[PDB]
């Protein structure tokens, strides 16, 4: 069992790399409202299999680029 | 520190008898206890809510001989301590060593008892204690040391204490000149004319 996060592929234009929004349902510190906040992450994916708008599971790894420290594990719900 | 002015002046201003003198003579004979001190003493102005609260606090402070900083610290400790705040405050003021000596009867006035304590006449559990504000604990023996056992004022004070009403929470032996602090004086043991709500409210503004 390893720590991993699910998210939607925002963009896949740069080769072998994708952008994965990992939006989280946090609560506001003061007012108590539950606000949807988003976390964009550059994820490394070999074979460029992922498309935009899909869902992907990713895990943390050693840094592969200036902004890329996450790697794809599996693609799920990749409909268009 | 200590108030060094006329004591019957404080008694007249407050209105009641604060036991600031030995009590051989009536306070009505020693002074005009009814009239307030000063040029405008005969006039009796109407006191407001803050006035009566301040009056009550001043009465307690003058009776026990405690200044504002020490009294405020006593209130803070009493509020912190569990239980009734006013009762705890009264219990602490009773716990004061000079008050204990006066209650046992080794002093005509609380000032005289404080005089003995300061001049190193008092042993607590075989330890010469010099501070008047020393908090006496239950099951503590308080004795007059042999140096002061020869003082005639102690014997005269013992006679005056025999005249006064004896406290139940202490047990004093006059021949040995030593008393045991049995327990904390309850509110029923303490005087009824003293009101605690006013003090608590005044310091809880």
């Amino acid at each position: 069992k390893i720590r991993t996060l699910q998210g939607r592929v925002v963009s896949d234009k740069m080769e072998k790399s994708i952008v994965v929004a990992i939006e989280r349902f946090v609560k506001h510190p003061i007012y108590g409202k539950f606000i949807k906040r988003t976390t964009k992450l550059h994820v490394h994916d070999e074979n460029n299999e992922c498309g935009i708008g899909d869902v992907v599971e990713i895990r943390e790894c050693r840094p592969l680029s200036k902004t890329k420290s996450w790697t794809l594990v599996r693609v799920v719900e990749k409909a268009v | 520190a200590r108030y060094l002015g006329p004591k019957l002046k404080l008694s007249r201003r407050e209105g009641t008898d604060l036991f600031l003198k030995s009590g051989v003579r009536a306070i009505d004979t020693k002074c005009k206890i009814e009239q307030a001190p000063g040029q405008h003493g005969a006039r009796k102005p109407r006191l407001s809510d803050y006035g009566v609260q301040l009056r009550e606090k001043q009465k307690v402070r003058r009776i026990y001989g405690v200044l504002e900083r020490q009294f405020r610290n006593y209130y803070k400790e009493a509020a912190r301590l569990k239980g009734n705040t006013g009762e705890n405050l009264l219990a602490l003021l009773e716990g004061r060593l000079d008050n204990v000596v006066y209650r046992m009867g080794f002093g005509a006035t609380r000032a005289e008892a404080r005089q003995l304590v300061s001049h190193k006449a008092i042993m607590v559990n075989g330890r010469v204690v010099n501070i008047a504000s020393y908090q006496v604990s239950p099951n503590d023996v308080v004795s007059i040391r042999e140096k002061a056992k020869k003082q005639s004022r102690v014997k005269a004070a013992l006679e005056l204490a025999e005249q006064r009403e004896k406290p139940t929470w202490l047990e004093v032996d006059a021949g040995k000149m030593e008393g045991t602090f049995k327990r904390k004086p309850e509110r029923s043991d303490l005087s009824a004319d003293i009101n605690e709500h006013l003090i608590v409210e005044l310091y809880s503004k």
Partner: protein, 122 residues
């Protein structure tokens, strides 16, 4: 009011400025009397109130009231000023400290001697 609106834009605390900005968060400040004169007070009252235009060490030139009966101040006289306005004097927001550098205490005072820099009589 709505928590959604508050999340979008919180409540911005109302910054209250100080009424004595020449002191610059200092209890007192030193200055030089540029001019000593008297002024007429505001409408409901009347007098000749003694004031000083003072150049402060931090560049500001302010006007300061001179409390007490009589003063020895003149031009080119270093004084110490503190906060506090005289109300019925337009633009005067500072008091001179009696009993300070090159400022004498009020003569023949027996009460409020500490406020007017008067030493204890024998």
């Amino acid at each position: 009011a709505t928590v959604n609106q508050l999340v979008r834009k919180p409540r911005a605390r109302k910054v209250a400025k100080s009424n004595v900005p020449a002191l610059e968060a200092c209890p007192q400040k030193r200055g030089v009397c540029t001019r000593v004169y008297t002024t007429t007070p505001k409408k409901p009252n009347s007098a000749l109130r003694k004031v000083c235009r003072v150049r402060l060490t931090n560049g500001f030139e302010v006007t300061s009231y001179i409390g007490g009966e009589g003063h020895n101040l003149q031009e080119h006289s270093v004084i110490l000023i503190r906060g506090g306005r005289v109300k019925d004097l337009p633009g005067v927001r500072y008091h001179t400290v009696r009993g300070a550098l090159d400022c004498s205490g009020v003569k023949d005072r027996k009460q409020a001697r500490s406020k007017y820099g008067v030493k204890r009589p024998k």
